[PDB]
Write a protein that binds this ligand. Structure first.
Ligand SMILES: [Ca+2]
Length: 120
């Protein structure tokens, strides 16, 4: 579910999940189109594409099992659905943490999201 994803993002980036990424770039908020404004934004793109492939399961509500192991986030689910959903949030969380350095709050105020549907 979104709460767990939120926890992850906070652990990796150290920022309040929704008020720093809730409306960032063209893909972090809800929906999404146009070119990624930046690395962080690109992270949110990939996550979106990740969610589409995970149709069967309910990406935003699916409760999965995840644990920390020496700092690392590990998805330990036997259910292919809950596991896949977990990996989608894990990946995103780590991608946002590796680009927190180029995070610019100006991307939640200024956005140029064209009509082109990106590559998944
Ligand atoms: Ca989105």
């Amino acid at each position: 579910n979104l709460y767990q994803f939120g926890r992850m993002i906070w652990n990796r980036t150290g920022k309040l999940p929704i008020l720093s990424y809730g409306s960032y770039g063209c893909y972090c908020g809800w929906g999404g189109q146009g070119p990624p404004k930046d690395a962080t934004d690109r992270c949110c793109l990939v996550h979106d594409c990740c969610y589409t492939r995970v149709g069967d399961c309910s990406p935003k509500m699916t409760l999965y099992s995840y644990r920390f192991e020496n700092g690392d986030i590990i998805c330990d689910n036997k259910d292919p659905c809950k596991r896949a959903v977990c990996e989608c949030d894990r990946e995103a969380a780590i991608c946002l943490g590796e680009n927190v350095n180029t995070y610019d709050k100006k991307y939640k105020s200024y956005e140029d999201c064209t009509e082109e549907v990106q590559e998944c």
